[PDB]
Design a protein around this ligand. Structure first.
Ligand code: TWE
Ligand code: TWE
Ligand code: CL
Ligand code: CL
Lengths: 9, 230, 230, 9
């Protein structure tokens, strides 16, 4: 299950 | 703290440089210093804070899972357990640091829906990460702390944001992962992801091309989980 | 040091776990503690030490290059220079730490060709990394320190190791990169890589299937550079 | 120019 990748911004 | 003598704007600028250099520990320390200046964070600044700590704890979680897997295989010297405990303690420290920033004093000063939902989603996420490694007497309280933060964020997002808002969608995505992975409620997880996806689909017609791209990107993450879960 | 109370064997075991968890800073600290126990390192242990610090300084070098590139574009506030200097100082500290371990006392206790060449290659590499960021009054001395270490390693390897020995081949590979990138001697770099490749090719017939695979893997790296340089 | 990758062992 994937959460928000949210690794790039 | 360690960053007390640096200008807020310099901390923000260096956080952006650290992201470009993939130096996420530095990025998190710079953004921690920016938060501790005491001013509210802009939309962009909130993203920098979140990206920094998500990367840091993401590496810790991946390491913890490798070591927990090795540890379980051995239980079928003390070194594997000791090193897993070391990584676990470091992860808990980072989660506590983020939760401390939200509690002192990001959340209480956040009055707009976009900022308040963003911070409460973060609070749910970092309690979820604590729950992933929790075993003892506080596992249930940690789980309920995650649930309570996610739930408050959901209530606000449903009242104040359109169904395609990327923060609303990502909140529902992560709350659904909470239901599936932490709360042992896969039916709640599937129902939340489905209802979130369907209500966003029906609102796409209101969006510009760029907003459409932002929303459909997160909707695909919901769809990916539904495909895995059904 | 920080690892003085842990058993040597536990430090080695945890270094291997850290590698599996991709926790290279931990791996390097564990192997630093193992070295400081004062006993010589086995072949496997030398590889753990080298892999750990190569990864750590590799990330620092990649970050330094990103920031140096941004800094040069800006010179066509002080923050980019300040943060590049911070990363640079951290990289220099890691290089100094590795060079300190080689000098106290890995190299002086290394009597076998395989160990002595391995450590001298390391010494050349970490002076090469210092040379990559050096500008001021010591850039030439740092360069000569790299050259001297590589040269001593080459002299021993040519006398004591077959031309297909992976350490001999990797030493020649990195010395050729030193010639090309640091010493402004591309013809020396090309000549070294060519002669190294050709002499290894002529020795492949002596090898087992597994040794053949080990040697041809490094020979391809020499070939890749020759293709880039010619 | 590539040096020894030497990142895995
Ligand atoms: C909590 C949260 C929700 C949504 C976003 C967001 O819009 N993005 C991050 C992930 C990226 C992908 N894939 C797209 C942009 C951030 C945080
Ligand atoms: C200094 C040095 C030389 C050779 C090796 C080595 O044999 N390996 C590391 C790189 C890997 C690849 N590609 C193959 C194995 C290590 C260190
Ligand atoms: Cl440990
Ligand atoms: Cl800085």
């Amino acid at each position: 299950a994937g959460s928000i990748p949210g690794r790039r911004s | 703290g360690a960053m007390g003598s640096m200008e807020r704007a310099s901390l923000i600028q260096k956080a952006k440089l650290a992201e470009q250099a993939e130096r996420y520990e530095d990025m998190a320390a710079f953004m921690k210093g920016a938060v501790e200046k005491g001013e509210e964070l802009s939309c962009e600044e909130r993203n920098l804070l979140s990206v920094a700590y998500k990367n840091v704890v993401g590496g810790q979680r991946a390491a913890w899972r490798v070591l927990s897997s090795i540890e379980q295989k051995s239980n079928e010297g003390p070194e594997v357990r000791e090193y897993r405990e070391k990584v676990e303690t470091e992860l808990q420290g980072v989660c506590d640091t983020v939760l401390g920033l939200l509690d002192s004093h990001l959340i209480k000063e956040a009055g707009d829906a976009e900022s308040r939902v963003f911070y409460l989603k973060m609070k749910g996420d970092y309690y979820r990460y604590l729950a992933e490694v929790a075993t003892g007497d506080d596992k249930k309280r940690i789980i309920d702390s995650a649930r309570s933060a996610y739930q408050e964020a959901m209530d606000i997002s449903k009242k104040e944001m359109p169904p395609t808002n990327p923060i609303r969608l990502g909140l529902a995505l992560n709350f659904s992962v909470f239901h599936y992975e932490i709360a042992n409620s896969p039916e709640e997880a599937i129902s939340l992801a489905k209802t979130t996806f369907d209500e966003a689909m029906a609102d796409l017609h209101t969006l510009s091309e760029d907003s459409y791209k932002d929303s459909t990107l997160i909707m695909q993450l919901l769809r990916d989980n539904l495909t895995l879960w059904t």
